[PDB]
Design a protein around this ligand. Structure first.
Ligand SMILES: CC(C)(COP(=O)(O)OP(=O)(O)OC[C@H]1O[C@@H](n2cnc3c(N)ncnc32)[C@H](O)[C@@H]1OP(=O)(O)O)[C@@H](O)C(=O)NCCC(=O)NCCS
Ligand SMILES: CC(=O)N[C@@H]1[C@@H](O)[C@H](O)[C@@H](COP(=O)(O)O)O[C@@H]1O
Ligand SMILES: CC(=O)N[C@@H]1[C@@H](O)[C@H](O)[C@@H](COP(=O)(O)O)O[C@@H]1O
Lengths: 156, 161
């Protein structure tokens, strides 16, 4: 599970605004975001912790960076939830996976999911889930995931 | 902070004292296990204080919204469900609600209690300003959820420790 030479993964930072918004736009609508508001979002994500009786960050936004060009090749996040079931169990929610086109087909998506999963299991999650489009199911099965249900949504 | 619902039920946020009844209810869903009153009390404290950053400081956004529907006839918990609020970067730093852990006690099944619960959770998420609310269900319940206004949006994938 190591990244290809030249690429590294790290927690998303305030200075990533431009590259991250650009990357996420290939996934869905992003819209207008100011540096000021992004600053605020990053502080929230950097401070929210999950009660643990070892510090658990509720948000774990990652970026994989191609060091040569300082370009964000991909981004993904894993959100940690504490429940009552499974003896006050922890559940990880992988969200907002996006790999830039120029960087796909190189194994970076799988390595990103692998790193997110590791973050979750290291925190003690009894399970990690995510929702994907039917056309991405095979990629997720190759990351070790299995079909568990149907995602249902309702929009405002 | 209680709200009456049709047919002699009312809804309210979960409390420390609901441990025994909530434990029994969630077993309808999956393993609950052993949970002490002190641990449960700490969980409730965490759930009552965790907020999602926002600018309407007049309406705090609770990260966790653990609800119980109590049967007035018996003053016992009939159902429980939660909606967890997540702040994203997409949709202009949008909010996504995640409905989780829906458990209706078996004596109440077939009474429309599930719908009542889901409808209240959705209201809670949209009142917070969520652009969408999602949940994962078994194939069997897709129809039930469609009766609640939800539509098939994708596939839930998991990996277990
Ligand atoms: C994340 C995503 C881009 C794939 O990332 P990726 O870096 O291209 O994929 P990887 O190189 O890590 O591939 C891992 C494995 O999954 C397979 N795979 C990737 N995409 C696949 C597809 N569409 N169909 C089938 N298998 C696929 C690869 O062949 C590889 O398997 P192998 O090791 O047996 O060869 C894609 O699966 C996805 O979910 N896209 C939606 C979100 C996003 O990034 N979107 C913009 C799309 S334009
Ligand atoms: C595994 C993964 O990345 N799933 C994503 C989800 O996290 C993201 O929020 C959403 C955006 O779609 P939306 O704009 O319709 O909400 O797409 C996919 O479901
Ligand atoms: C809509 C709904 O209620 N979905 C629940 C989910 O929230 C819960 O965590 C899980 C328990 O199953 P588990 O023990 O397999 O985690 O069951 C269902 O998928």
């Amino acid at each position: 599970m190591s990244l290809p030479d030249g690429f590294y993964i790290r927690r998303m930072e305030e200075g990533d605004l431009e590259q991250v918004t650009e990357t996420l736009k290939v996934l869905t609508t992003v819209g207008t975001i100011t540096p000021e508001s992004f600053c605020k979002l990053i502080k929230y994500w950097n401070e929210a912790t999950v009660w643990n009786d070892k510090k658990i960050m509720q948000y774990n936004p990652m970026v994989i960076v191609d060091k040569r060009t300082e370009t964000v090749a991909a981004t993904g996040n894993i959100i940690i939830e504490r429940k009552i079931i499974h003896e006050l169990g922890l559940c990880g929610h992988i969200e907002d996976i996006a790999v830039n086109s120029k960087y796909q087909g190189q194994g970076l998506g799988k390595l990103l999911i692998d790193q997110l999963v590791t973050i979750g299991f290291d925190y003690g999650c009894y399970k990690i889930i995510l929702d994907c489009d039917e056309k991405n199911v095979k990629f997720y099965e190759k990351c070790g995931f299995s079909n568990a249900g149907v995602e249902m949504q309702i929009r405002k």
